[PDB]
Amino acid sequence: LESWRQLVEIILTACPQDLITEHRQLIIRDLLQDLHVKILDDDELMPIVAGAVFTLTAHLSQSVRTELKQTENISAGFASIGDSSLHMILRNLLEFIGFQRVRAHLYGSLLYYLQIATAPEDVFSKLQRDNLSIFESYGTALMEVVCRDACDGHDIGRMLALALLDRIVSVDRQQQWLLYLSNSGYLKVLVDSLAEDDVVLRNPLLKALYIYESKMAFLTRVAKSGAIELLRSGVIVRLAQCQVYDMRPETPAPVERYRQILLPALQICQLILTSSTAQHLQAAGQVLQFLVAHSDTIQAILRSMMELQGHIGRFQRQCLALLNRFGGSDRLRQLSLQDDSSRLDGVSKKDDMESLGVVIHLLKQSANNFFTYYDIHRQSVGKDEIKELCQSEMKISTTQKYGLAR
Q1: What does DSSP assign to residue 395?
Q2: Where is the signal peptide (predicted)?
């Protein structure tokens, strides 16, 4: 049997290469039908289940890519029945739980859900509601097990377990999962476990890398945009790690990595500070505190003509406020980000055939406004301060009042 299945896993890869398809999707569905019955029926077997999950990810991912690229009406109703089957696959895998394999496949499913995130939107939202319902059918016991695996001795298991948790919070809309994670003590564990994400980075593989990339993207999104439960276990202590990393960097490539880690920690801290303020305004004492006891290392991370000079002047001493404003201004200028996406879409359309006018029009318009208001911020640099900087990122009257207030 181990030979027959490993033969299917290698035959499967060849089929995928050939596809590189509706027929392939049908084959995947057939595999799921055979696979689903076996998994539900019985608990070697765990390894086979993991292999099946990997195959699904290989095919499911391809299907997702095809959807992104996108018989228009018919293909949508083939995907939705697919997802309906894949949900009842996910449910049997949870009941049957091998655990590491489940975490890997579960993490992949979470990533797929994130990717999915007006009819398509309605369907995605409906799926999210349904996914939550499915999780509820699973119950409280699943979460504790997931939490335990994030801090084990099986290095692939714990990566997949943590990557899965990002997706469970991302698809939630009633916030009961975060309350369950505080109740089990996971956040406290995750103090040392953020230390351990650090040690993870310190110490299948491709899938793990993709999951890490997705987590980084989620962190970036949070920075651009639970805070109580994190702060209540000692966010400052968790931060101490970032300071230590910065110190290590001060003491090459390792130093650069430490700086990057510090930058990652700082964004999270900022996100925590903003959310808490409405009910816990004294967390603005905590932002003012140790947070920016840094030097040079913060200035490099916050930057990684007139606007640059202003950022440099702010990084001199006073406060790290101005820096964040400079980063926001750079992000606003980077309106090619949409232009780059448009160029990628045009390339995808050419590939489908074997239309970037909106993209270049976006980038040029952003360029004109960027240089104009950037020289305006230069004139600002020639002459409540944080709020004024935010407004500038988004004039002489606010400038004279800020220059009388500074």
Answers
A1: -
A2: none
Distances (CA, A) of 126 to 111, 113, 129, 284, 304: 17, 12, 5, 38, 39
Cα distances from 199 to residues 26, 39, 155, 261, 304, in angstroms, run: 41, 34, 11, 11, 23
Instruction: Provide the token pair at 242.
Output: 């970032």
Rg of the Cα atoms in the chain: 25
Q: Entry resolution in angstroms? A: 5.5
Among 117, 56, 48, 118, CA closest to 85: 56
Region for residue 42 given its phi and psi (left: phi exceeds 0; alpha: psi -120 to 50; beta: otherwise): beta
Report CA 287 to chain centroid distance, whole Å: 24
The CA distance from 110 to 169, in Å, is 10
Sign of the alpha-carbon torsion through 29, 31, 34, 35: negative
Cβ contact 84:31 at 8 Å:
no
Tokens 């029009």 sit on residue: 361
From residue 40, give the alpha-carbon distance in Å to each of 45, 53, 55, 140: 11, 14, 18, 20
Compute the half-sphere exposure of residue 67: CA atoms within 13 Å on the CB side of its CA: 24
Q: Under a CB-based contact definition with an 8 Å cutoff, are residues 222 and 267 in contact?
A: yes
On whether the CB atoms of residues 147 and 186 are closer than 8 A, the answer is: yes
- Please answer whether residues 132 and 170 qualify as being in contact, where contact means their C-beta atoms are separated by less than 8 angstroms: no
